């Protein structure tokens, strides 16, 4: 998925 | 409120912050950054090392290195817009693990859109390399 | 093989950097990024330029004469859209001065019109003595 | 334009 920013 | 779409330098520096922060606190949750086609490498045996792929292989690899009391001294972060809305990130700094020697390194990240959500990225490439193992 | 492509490029990129740095511009397009160390008036690392037109202008102004290179590590992998990242570690010497260690990162993108042709989408060169 | 393989 990854990371939110 | 709504903010303008951020530059790669911002995306590739907030990620670096979140990366080493998580690496120090919850290194077992570091695998959330990756996908099925992600690559990961560190090196050190015994012929540096070859890469691993996928969230399962990367997680097992991260746990093998035992990141306890991880401290990083980030010196310089480069983040440019690469091909197809991606962000290439080069990191130069110091790394100490398991309360041992502070070691100089370089790291290359490749952040790609998840598709999926509003401006969320995931790690496609993770290339770490200790300098004392090269020169 | 992304490993072979990236490593043969490193050989080409540094052989050309010594023999004819004026012909180094053909590696880049109009969306390429380029930075090769340097500091500001304040003393902090310089910015990057974009496009072959500006990349060429920057290379010529850096005056590469008798560039020498001892590549110590090349690790090349695959990115999105058939791209190839190349991490480079070694030493560089310009104008017959001392060898300075460096950390570099390439992003090789498919040219699109010709078979097995790649161009440099990103070129991030950094000297270690100007950062550490 | 770039290098070839």
Residue numbers in the entry:
A (entry chain D), D (entry chain C): 2 to 6
B (entry chain B): 1 to 46, 50 to 138
C (entry chain A): 7 to 138
What does the paper say about this structure?
Co-crystallization of G3BP1 1–139 with the FxFG peptide under the same conditions as for G3BP1 1–139 alone resulted in long needle-like crystals that differed significantly in morphology from the rectangular crystals obtained for the unliganded form of G3BP1 1–139. Electron density corresponding to the FxFG peptide was unambiguously located in a hydrophobic pocket between helices αI and αII in chain A and chain B, and residues 2–5 (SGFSF) of the peptide was subsequently modeled and included in refinement. All residues, 1–139, were modeled in chain A, while residues 47–49 remain disordered in chain B. Thus, more residues could be modeled in the peptide complex than in the unliganded structure. This suggests that the NTF2-like domain and in particular loops VI and VII become more ordered upon binding of the peptide. Apart from this, no major changes in backbone and side chain conformations are observed, and an all-atom superposition of the unliganded structure and the ligand bound form provides a calculated rmsd of 0.44 Å. The peptide adapts a β-strand conformation, where the N-terminal phenylalanine, Phe4, from the FxFG motif is held in place by G3BP through parallel-displaced pi-stacking with Phe15 and Phe124, and T-shaped pi-packing with Phe33 from G3BP1. The second phenylalanine, Phe6, in the peptide forms hydrophobic contacts to Leu10, Val11 and the Cβ and Cγ atoms of Glu14. In addition to the hydrophobic interactions, four hydrogen bonds from the backbone of the peptide to G3BP1 exist. Interestingly, the glycine residue contained in the FxFG repeat could not be modeled into electron density, suggesting that it may mainly be important to provide structural flexibility and not as a contributor of binding energy. Especially, the orientation of Phe4 is highly conserved between peptide chains C and D, indicating that this residue is highly important.
